[PDB]
Symmetry: C2
Subunit: 329 residues, 2 copies
Amino acid sequence: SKLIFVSMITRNGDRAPFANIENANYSWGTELSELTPIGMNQEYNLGLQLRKRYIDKFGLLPEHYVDQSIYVLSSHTNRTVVSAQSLLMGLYPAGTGPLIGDGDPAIKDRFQPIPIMTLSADSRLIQFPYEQYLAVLKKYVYNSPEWQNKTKEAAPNFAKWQQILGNRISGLNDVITVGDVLIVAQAHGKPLPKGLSQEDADQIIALTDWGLAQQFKSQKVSYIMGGKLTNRMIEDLNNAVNGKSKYKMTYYSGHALTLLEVMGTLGVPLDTAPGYASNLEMELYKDGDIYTVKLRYNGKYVKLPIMDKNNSCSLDALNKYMQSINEKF
Amino acid sequence: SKLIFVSMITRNGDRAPFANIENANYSWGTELSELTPIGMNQEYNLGLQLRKRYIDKFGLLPEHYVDQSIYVLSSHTNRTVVSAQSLLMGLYPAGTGPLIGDGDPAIKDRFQPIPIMTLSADSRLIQFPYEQYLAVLKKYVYNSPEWQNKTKEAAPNFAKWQQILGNRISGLNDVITVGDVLIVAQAHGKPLPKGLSQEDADQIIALTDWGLAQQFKSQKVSYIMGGKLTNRMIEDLNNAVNGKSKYKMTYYSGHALTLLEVMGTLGVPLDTAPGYASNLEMELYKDGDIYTVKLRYNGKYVKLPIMDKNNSCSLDALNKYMQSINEKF
Ligand code: PRO
Ligand code: PRO
């Protein structure tokens, strides 16, 4: 059985936060929401790793980029485009790019350009529009028993946290909001805000991780946001078999929620929120007329309910599995 | 007076053709419509030249890329994205990209990622949808006196050209179709199709050049297709003065028609079809409260009807001029 196609999602690399903690004066060196040099490096290294896997080990992809062999589609954000570019700088690194004339590089250092398309900003495929996302949470998540129970447990800390950080804190949603800033601060080795102990920072960060993952423990929520992309990825697999497409890989450059909503849709929701440059791959294998699929997340295979002891299932079985999810929602 | 903002359009670099000449067996080394290594090189060199101009000479832009300083928007084609990427590898070359840790490169060779967004495929901003374009030609161009006169002149050659090339040739539109293939062949040093003399190839290519430019000698045609982008570029200039934007440059990665339609809209239509990596810049200058604009095309300033002996006009004058064009169409 040989690997014949992969569909992949990444979360972007390390970025600045989206907003500030009111009572801290952090300086990021990068504009809000933008990918940092650290984030470029993370994606670049993921690219190098993917080269070792999909080029060197499996030989699915060649050492020099073949035009139209990879379809790359990004959400409409700078960080996801730059993340995909950085990753592709690892997958097809300097030295492998095209030559002109008598073996002279088309671009200095033999860089390899690989096209990246972006969705429109209003597309719901990779990044669910924020207001619609929050509306989904308000309706399906915030009043769920699990969210209410966790709110009750965390609630006695809200007043203290609000007074320390300055930002409004009146529910788990607000905890997640400031939690992302603290995650970025920690990732950049910044000191704690004055009066926020490490213990408290740890609690806020833990609640943030818990909250993000909890949202997608609901398959219904996951499907609303991720059903479209999950269907599309499986259709990509089908297209590598039915002759509709000649791509060796489709790559969707996305966000933490993109990974969460797909894993959640497939009925294997993540226990923890995806870190920077987290990634999932649907791998399609061929042995004559037998097609098999495996699902890899952050370097480890994942067993869907329909999979055998070897974390594998037929592509037919995956189609039937997805079909039933579609019918369910 | 100091340069404070530039808006730029490029045509993509050298590409394979869109279709084949039936009676030739050309091999391109690249898929149809895709940018070639030569095209990557052309755009990369254009980038280097733009660095010498807008970074070294004018000092508008810094030597190291500032996030959110340049807005790059491409049509939804591989060649325009890859052309923009290649250009940006010249504008902000290896060695200038970000560092992490203790002066260690974020990406090997200090590559600089710069985000590129794409329009949707159905957007009319940069690339007018092909069928709609042809509809515009059929209605406004093909029956114009100039088109009919040239048709009558060229018509005695159609039978011969069709029999030699194989492709249908029954009007100037068909000449332009095969003419692009001959342009690509010549650019790649391919031999002529059997039975097509150099004289005949020269005639077909000259008609192709003439035809493409002729379309935009009509300001009405130019405005239908290019009014939106022309207005947008001037609005970019306004945004650099009114405080609405902090970009130093907006860059629209487009096609021959993109250049043709904007130049045509401005009432300065091109005499000849834009070659690969042709480019235009709207330059905005500031001396206190006085704002002046210049228009550069392929390395030379262009005098709009409203400009003085020095190829310059006030931004106020440019707005009024565009306002009247809008009112006219
Ligand atoms: O997660 C956030 O807070 C930002 C807001 C729009 C989507 N990303
Ligand atoms: O010019 C051409 O022929 C191709 C067809 C769609 C637009 N570009």
